[PDB]
Design a protein around this nucleic acid. Sequence first.
RNA 1: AUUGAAAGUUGUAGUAUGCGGUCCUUGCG
DNA 2: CGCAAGGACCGCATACTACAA
Lengths: 149, 150, 200, 345, 342
Amino acid sequence: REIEQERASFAFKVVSDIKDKYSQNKKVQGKYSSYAEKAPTIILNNGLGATLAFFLSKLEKPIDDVDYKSINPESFGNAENIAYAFLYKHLSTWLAEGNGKDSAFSGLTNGEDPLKYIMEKTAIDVAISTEEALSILNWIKKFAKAMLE
Amino acid sequence: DIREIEQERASFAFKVVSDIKDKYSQNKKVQGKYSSYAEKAPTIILNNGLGATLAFFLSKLEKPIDDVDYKSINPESFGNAENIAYAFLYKHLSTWLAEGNGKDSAFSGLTNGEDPLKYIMEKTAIDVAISTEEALSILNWIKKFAKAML
Amino acid sequence: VYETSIRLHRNYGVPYIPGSALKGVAKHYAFSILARENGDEILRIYESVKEDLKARIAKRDKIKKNDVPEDYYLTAAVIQELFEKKFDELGAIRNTRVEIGDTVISVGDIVKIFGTQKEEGSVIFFDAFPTPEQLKDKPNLELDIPIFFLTVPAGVEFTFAVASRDLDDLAEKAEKLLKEALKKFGVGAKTSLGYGRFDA
Amino acid sequence: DMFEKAVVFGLYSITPVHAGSGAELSVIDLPIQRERHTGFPVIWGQSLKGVLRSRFRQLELDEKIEVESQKWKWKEKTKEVLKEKADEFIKKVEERKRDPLLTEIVFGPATDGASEHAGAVSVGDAKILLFPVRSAKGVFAFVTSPIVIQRLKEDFELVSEIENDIELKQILSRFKVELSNNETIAGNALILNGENKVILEDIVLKVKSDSNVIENLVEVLKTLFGDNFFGKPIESIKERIAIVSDDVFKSFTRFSTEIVARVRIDAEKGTVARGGLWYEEFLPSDTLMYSLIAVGSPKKENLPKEVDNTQKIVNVLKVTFNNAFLQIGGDETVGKGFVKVRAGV
Amino acid sequence: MFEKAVVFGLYSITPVHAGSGAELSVIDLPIQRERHTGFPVIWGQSLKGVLRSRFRQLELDEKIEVESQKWKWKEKTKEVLKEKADEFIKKVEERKRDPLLTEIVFGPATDGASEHAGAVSVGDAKILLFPVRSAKGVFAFVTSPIVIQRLKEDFELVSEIENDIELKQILSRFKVELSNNETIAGNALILNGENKVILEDIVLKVKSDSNVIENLVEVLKTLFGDNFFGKPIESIKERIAIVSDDVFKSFTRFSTEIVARVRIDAEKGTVARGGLWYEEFLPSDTLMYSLIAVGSPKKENLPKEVDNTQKIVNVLKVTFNNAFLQIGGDETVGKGFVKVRA
RNA sequence: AUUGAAAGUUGUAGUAUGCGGUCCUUGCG
DNA sequence: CGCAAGGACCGCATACTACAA
């Protein structure tokens, strides 16, 4: 259940961080809450790689190369862009490192970029990454719906 | 040790799309035309047929449709931006349908080192249908990455 | 593969008019007639939506927010946004009676007929199929220009239909609106150059 | 289990249909329902049940439902059955809290009273039966596959088990086809004038010479759907039927469906809204669809004397839905998803 | 005990959904699985319940061919229980107890659960064949060596009941091991190119030891009649694939059907609150078997017609053979219809 | 030469009942 | 002479152990 506590703490932390940015602006809060809610549906239909590609595409920038790091969500112009960059940042962070070296979940990607990891790995790695992303998204849905405006 | 074709599709699509950005970074018109063509090809494929679309690509490249050699089409030869984009798109599609990701990779094409146009010319319907399915999937992935990055 | 194409029927090859085009042209014509007559009231009532649309147009056009003119096109865009997601406040202006043809139709009737995001419409727009009798002798297709494309020649008959899914009798008003829209605006590409006009 | 009678429902599309299956990121933005392993199109039983229940409730509310040549008034009939509690039921029904009496009895209770009892109908899936495909000589053939015939034989076996009548099994027992990968048991009309060949779509292939099969197929259609295939004479269908192998049949259901490019033009610019461009996928018109409905004994306590036996319920449904027009799938107002229904036994 | 054994084979006519426990995780209502491995399964409790219900319903219609005699519930009960029988008949009228035959075979009802156990035992139904989409051909049956291993274990267990040495030898004759990606494929599924059988999203390499596959078909002809649940067995013999364990497990998790369902409001014309949800369905044409065991009938004063394990086994075999069964939830929407071959 | 020797948490029991992937939208200037 | 879905709704309500030993 240590992994469960880790997931809950991470979801609360990211939802609170989204709360801090544009706390009064119900536009960013509303868009992000719907974005987290609708995300798990895509994963079931098209798999993890397709969903990550879609997240990368919806960002409005040249987006040269692929980096789970960088891409500051505040640097995005439109509110939808900011919310999508936030969602991508959180999911990629959790899949790469989880919460840290000392955390119960160190992340399946060993700190590597999730998209590059999917591109150069085996099938089983993709399977476990998919299942973990689904679980964290399940928790994040509830925690973002509960408190974010 | 087993990678589905989905891994190889994304790996291949990332390879070519990134190969365009570094090559033709300043030619934003080339990038835009390539993106538009990648967006528009699957409807042509679904409406007419893979052979029809390949012949159309050749026609826009002022080349005969009877004898082709995708391995002998340098994209840099074309002068017009539309022509260069069409050459690049045709070369990518044919290379995937011939060799796939690679001989070492799990997927190694379908024609087994044959020009895909000739393969459609001289094969039964089922092979053509499967090749059409593969072309549709790779076109979807290439469109995804081109929209994302280009 | 050819640079041009037409919506030819799959099973038979006769050209036909989809019901979606009917519904779209009817909604567009209703918006145009509503904006042309009661433009000032609509522009004044929803001031916040007007400002937001002006800001969006300025951002898309890379121009100043004040540079946007309050022409009829801006009114049409505002009305379109009103019938979009921000359709709850439309009930504020749910009193104007647009004189469509020879009958007054309320905006509330427009919402009840065309349908909104939170409520399905009560009027179905079937498709249009040329009568076979006309095709028996008169040709049904023609060339039109070294760029050529196939078009339906003038005088070709077309039958349209409209149903009322619910007990609302908005079918007659919908039929009148469709007839007026076909007479004035018409349906089809290149509608600026007279294409798509329909007589009685 | 509890079923005793069954009816075979036949669906004939007159307008393109689109049963939604969510949205994907592939080339087709709004695809259609398909079985995963086979890949053939299909309409699940849940959509059919919902549409049938909605139509039944609508007809009962307007008191246009004629059971035993008499209107089944929602308030009057339920007054006798529910007795003292009928006032509460009538008010609840008027508040759109529970379905009327007849719908509740037939299609099971409503959402509020889901734990009251069970239903009495078991409408099943709609497996494909006849795919309309463009042809070179002749027009609009009705392609089918041996897999479809095998599934049909299985459903006929199930029906004969429910009805305890081996006539269906005897009728279908003659079906045994072994078509090769490039040979069709084609009808005379579709045959191209030449070396006994047929050009269907992009496939041209030789015609196997066989008989006493196609006719059998047509006979099956005459057993349930009267004598007219959705109104048209059965002779044209008999002369216009073709059968091909599984591979080419699957290849047809993957690249011979309607594809549309619907958009939404914004008023300000007059060309297209941002992101207003997508492709929708539709089943073609004149597709022959079939499904099975099984009827068991009613389970509601103190049911009205009119509906007590499964025979009465079967008669009611057959009378109500025979040769009717129904809406299936999305875009109802746009003008897509209208079919003609036929019953039988 | 359990001196007799009957193997039950099930074929899914329509998609089957056997409801799991609590509706957790992303998928709302998932099929029953086992955490131990991850394959689909059907617990024996549901199978026993549906079999008991069908048997009782048939018995109430006097359609059960007890030694080709059409045993009557009331007559047999009066003959056996004698004086008290009438009272039990009243309990049968109130739908409290159950008729004599079903009470003897499947055990008593809840209120009388203190007299004798059930003379039968129904094992968990385990997968043996899984449909999977294929590039060339269509709808290839798939299986894995671990499935055959479990089948051999089941055969050995049966041998501890009837001493079926020949069955044990036949099962032991089959021993294959595909290492990582290679597969044993029939002639149809093989792509026209050099080997390269493509299943779903994976490209494999054929292996030229197909005799084993043939042997497997023979085992089927030995177990479930001659026709493969109503189709030519040799016809199915051309579309059987054997793949490695991990690939088969991947197939049994990411190839079940997934369906989204909604509820439409009475007059709004759109979905309502709490309307959208998801469901997971086991694909059609899935082949799953089981193991029914029968021991000594423990009922007091059993009827002469059914008083030995052989009699009960014969009754079960005749009653359930090419019959049809409704399994699991979502009955009214045409889910759960299966064909049973004994 | 010990509050000791002896005793199968065992029998019955279907995650089942109700539920329309639906609404909004011109392929166009 | 180009344009490239987007939001709504995201399991509800009920059942929620009985009898022996």
